Design a protein around this nucleic acid. Structure first.
Ligand code: A1A2C
Ligand code: DG3
Ligand code: MG
Length: 634
DNA sequence: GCGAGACTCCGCGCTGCGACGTCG
DNA sequence: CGACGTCGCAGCGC
C-alpha cells in the first residue's frame, strides 16, 4: 500500500480493463505529465481512490503496439468528456493551465465538472498564502509528505506533473500528484460543506476559473503600430517637458531623484515647504498652483510611467496569432486575492492608463489625446464590447445599509464624483475633468472606507481640521451608511470574520487587537471586504452566466484556442470572446453579426446576476477599440 | 518562539526603476 | 570603476 503505478498502456488487455473501470467512476483526479524536449505531454495519471495511480502513457517502448497513439487519444477524449446527463467530477491541480495544455498540446477539450484544490484552499481562507502541492500535503496529508520529500518542484505554484523543469520522470511526478490531490480534495470538500461553501465552489468559483481559461486562450487583440505611434508622441512631449523644466530650475536635475526635486522646489525655488521636503503626488498637486515646475514633474511621471511600464511591456509580450492575422497579448489571470476580485499578470492589462491629454507645439500647444487603450483592438472585422456595472459598490452599500440618502443619490442624483469636486473646488460640476473627477473618486471611497482627516487634508490641499469637517458632514448626511459600518465592526469583533453576499468569509483577527493601528486597519478591512468582495461575487456570477448562455448557440466557439484547433482538424468567426475583466466591467471580443445578440445577453445576465433591493444598472459600450468605445443602446 | 517600534490609520492590486551592496 | 543583484517604492489600474 505504497505508490503503485499501473502502466495501463503496456498491455492491451490491461488497458481495456482500465478504460472499463475509468468509465464507471463518477469522481477521479488527473495529473498531466509534461517534459522538456517543451510543452510535451508524455502522459497523464488517473486516480480514483487509495494510493493507486494509473499512468496512461501518451508516447514508452514497453507499450503494446496495438495501442496506437491515435487509439489512445480516442480513449483519452472519450473518458474526459461527458454525455451531458451523467455528472462526473475531475480533480485537477492548477486546472486552468492543465485545461489549456490538454487543448493546445493534445487537442482535447475537457467537458466535465472540475475541482481545483488550489481554489478550494483560497475559498476557505482568502488571505492564506497561495497554495503549493507541498502546502496542501503539509496541511491535509502530512503523513504523505515523504512522497514529495524528494520532489522539489512541490513547493512551487506550478503543478507537479506540469513542471517540466525537474530531474524526476514525468511518470513519477504525475502519479504522485494524482493520489495526493485526489485525497486532499476529498478533505477540502468536507471542509467546504462544513463551511457551507461547496455550492459557491462548484457553481461560481470553479466555473469562474473555466471562464478565465477561455480568456487566457483568447488573449486580447493588440495593435503594435498604434502603441508605437503613441510612444513617439509621448517621448517628444517628454523631451520638451525636460527642456522647459531645466530652464525653470536654471539647471539640469533628475526627475527620478527625490532629492534633486526637493532641492529645486524647496531649497532653491523657496516653494512652500509643507515631515517636509516630500515630492509626493499630493504635495505636487498643491504646489502646481503656485509654480509651473510641480505640474511638469507630475506630467513627466505620468508619461514616463506610460512608456516604461506600459509601452515596453506590451510590445515585449505581444505574440502573433496567425489564424486571426493579428498580434495579441496573453495575460495570466490571478484569483487568489483577499476579496475575490480577479487580477492579471505578465502583463497586467488592468493597469493600462486612462485617457490623458498632452499639449504639444508652440503658442500654448495644441491638445492631443493619449489613449493607450486604443491600442487594444478586436480581430479584423470585429468589435469590442464593454458592459459596466454602474456604481456597483455604491449600490451594494445601499442594499446593505438601506441609507435612503445614498439610494436617492443613486436613483435620481447626478454623478457623485463630479458633485464632490464641485463642493470641494467651488466650481461647476460640468467643468470637472477626468483628472479632477478621479481625485474626487478616491476622496469619495476613501472617506466611505475610513480615511482620516490628516490624509484627506493632504489629498484636498487643506489642513487636518478643515478636512475633519468634510468627514463629519458625510457621517451626518449618511447615517444609514454610518450605522452599517458600526454594525459591521461589531459583528466582526464577535465572529472574527466578515461575509460577502455569497457567504465567503475573510478572517480578520486584528479586529480584537489592542494596538490602535492594527485594530483600525482590521475595522476598515471588515467594511471594505464586505462591499468590494460582494462586488467581486456579482461580477463572477455574471461572467459564468454569460458564458453559459453564449454556449447555447451552436455557432459559438468556446475560445480562439478551440476554433484554431478545429481549423487544423471553414469557420467564420462568430460569438463573443471573453478578453478582460475590470472589477466592475467585462470586455468581450464579438463578431459583427452577433454584436447585438451578445450585447443583449451580457446586459440581461448582468442585470439579473443577483437580486438586491437596488437595481443593478448596466451600460454597454461597443467600439473599434478599448479606447474608442461608444454607447450602445442594446 | 516572542512581538520592539514609537514605525504603521481608505481598500484591493501589479511591476520597472532607483538606492544601496556586492563580487571581481 | 562596472556589471550584475535585490528588495521596496511609487507609479499606475479599479
Ligand atoms: C445629493 N444631495 C444634493 C447632496 C449633495 O450631493 C452634497 N454632496 C456632495 C458630495 N456628497 C457625497 C456623497 C457621497 C455618496 F453619495 F457616495 F454617499 C459620499 C461623499 C463622501 F464620501 F465623499 F463624503 C460625499 O461627499 C460629502 O458628503 N462631503 C461632505 C464632501 C464633499 C466634498 C469633498 F471634497 C469631501 C467631502 C454629497 O452628499
Ligand atoms: N477603496 C477604494 N475603492 C476604489 C477606489 N477606486 C476604485 N475603487 C473600487 C470601488 C469602485 C470600483 C470600480 O470603480 P471605477 O472607477 O471602475 O467605477 P466608479 O467608481 O463607479 O466610477 P465610473 O462609473 O466613472 O467608472 O473600484 C479607491 O480609490 N478606493
Ligand atoms: Mg464603474
Amino acid at each position: 500500500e505504497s505508490l503503485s503505478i499501473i502502466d495501463v498502456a503496456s498491455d492491451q488487455n490491461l488497458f481495456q480493463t482500465f478504460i472499463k473501470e475509468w468509465r464507471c467512476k463518477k469522481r477521479f483526479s488527473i495529473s498531466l505529465a509534461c517534459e522538456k524536449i517543451d510543452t510535451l505531454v508524455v502522459g497523464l495519471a488517473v486516480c480514483w481512490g487509495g494510493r493507486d495511480a494509473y499512468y496512461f502513457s501518451l508516447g514508452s517502448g514497453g507499450l503494446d503496439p496495438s495501442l496506437t497513439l491515435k487509439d489512445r487519444m480516442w480513449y483519452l477524449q472519450s473518458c474526459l468528456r461527458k454525455e451531458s446527463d451523467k455528472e462526473c467530477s475531475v480533480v485537477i491541480y492548477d486546472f486552468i493551465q492543465s485545461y489549456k495544455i490538454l487543448l493546445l498540446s493534445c487537442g482535447i477539450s475537457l467537458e466535465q465538472s472540475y475541482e481545483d484544490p488550489k481554489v478550494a484552499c483560497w475559498l476557505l481562507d482568502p488571505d492564506s498564502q497561495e497554495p503549493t502541492l507541498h502546502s496542501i500535503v503539509t496541511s491535509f496529508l502530512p503523513h504523505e509528505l515523504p512522497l514529495l520529500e524528494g520532489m522539489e518542484t512541490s513547493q512551487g505554484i506550478q503543478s507537479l506533473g506540469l513542471n517540466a523543469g525537474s530531474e524526476h520522470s514525468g511518470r513519477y511526478r504525475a502519479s504522485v500528484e494524482s493520489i495526493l490531490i485526489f485525497n486532499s480534495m476529498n478533505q477540502l470538500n468536507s471542509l467546504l460543506q462544513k463551511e457551507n461553501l461547496q455550492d459557491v465552489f462548484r457553481k461560481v468559483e470553479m466555473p469562474s476559473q473555466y471562464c478565465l481559461a477561455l480568456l487566457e486562450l483568447n488573449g486580447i487583440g493588440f495593435s503594435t503600430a498604434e502603441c508605437e505611434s503613441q510612444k513617439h508622441i509621448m517621448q517628444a512631449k517628454l523631451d520638451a517637458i525636460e527642456t522647459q523644466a531645466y530652464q525653470l530650475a536654471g539647471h539640469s536635475f533628475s526627475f527620478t531623484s527625490s532629492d534633486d526635486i526637493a532641492e529645486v522646489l524647496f531649497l532653491e525655488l523657496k516653494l512652500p515647504p509643507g515631515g517636509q521636503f516630500s515630492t509626493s503626488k499630493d504635495v505636487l498637486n498643491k504646489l502646481k498652483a503656485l509654480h509651473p515646475l510641480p505640474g511638469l514633474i507630475l506630467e513627466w511621471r505620468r508619461i514616463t510611467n506610460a512608456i516604461t511600464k506600459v509601452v515596453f511591456p506590451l510590445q515585449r509580450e505581444k505574440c502573433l496569432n496567425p489564424f486571426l492575422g493579428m498580434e495579441r497579448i496573453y495575460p495570466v489571470s490571478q484569483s487568489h486575492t483577499a476579496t475575490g476580485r480577479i487580477t492579471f499578470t505578465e502583463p497586467n492589462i488592468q493597469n493600462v492608463p486612462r485617457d490623458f491629454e498632452i499639449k504639444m507645439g508652440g503658442s500654448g500647444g495644441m491638445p492631443f489625446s493619449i489613449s493607450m487603450r486604443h491600442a487594444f483592438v478586436p480581430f479584423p472585422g470585429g468589435s469590442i464590447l464593454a458592459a459596466d456595472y454602474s456604481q456597483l459598490e455604491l449600490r451594494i452599500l445601499a442594499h446593505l445599509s438601506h441609507d435612503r440618502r445614498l439610494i436617492q443619490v443613486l436613483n435620481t442624483g447626478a454623478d457623485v464624483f463630479r458633485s464632490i469636486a464641485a463642493e470641494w473646488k467651488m466650481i461647476e460640476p460640468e467643468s470637472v475633468g477626468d483628472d479632477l473627477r478621479q481625485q474626487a473618486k478616491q476622496i469619495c471611497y476613501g472617506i466611505i472606507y475610513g480615511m482620516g482627516a490628516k490624509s484627506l487634508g493632504e489629498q484636498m490641499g487643506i489642513k487636518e481640521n478643515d478636512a475633519a469637517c468634510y468627514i463629519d458632514s458625510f457621517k451626518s448626511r449618511y447615517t444609514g451608511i454610518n450605522q452599517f459600518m458600526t454594525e459591521t465592526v461589531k459583528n466582526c469583533k464577535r465572529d472574527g470574520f466578515v461575509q460577502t453576499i455569497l457567504g465567503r468569509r475573510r478572517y480578520l483577527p486584528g479586529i480584537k487587537d489592542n494596538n490602535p493601528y492594527r485594530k483600525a486597519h482590521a475595522e476598515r478591512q471588515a467594511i471594505n471586504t464586505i462591499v468590494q468582495g460582494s462586488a467581486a461575487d456579482i461580477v463572477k456570477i455574471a461572467t459564468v452566466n454569460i458564458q453559459k448562455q453564449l454556449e447555447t448557440f451552436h455557432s459559438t466557439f468556446k475560445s480562439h484556442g478551440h476554433r484554431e484547433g478545429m481549423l487544423q482538424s471553414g469557420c467564420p468567426i462568430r460569438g463573443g470572446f471573453f478578453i478582460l475583466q475590470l472589477h466592475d466591467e467585462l470586455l468581450y471580443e464579438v463578431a459583427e453579426e452577433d454584436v447585438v445578440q451578445v450585447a443583449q445577453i451580457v446586459k440581461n445576465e448582468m442585470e439579473s446576476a443577483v437580486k438586491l433591493s437596488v437595481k443593478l444598472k448596466v451600460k454597454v459600450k461597443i467600439g473599434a477599440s478599448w479606447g474608442e468605445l461608444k454607447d450602445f443602446d442594446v
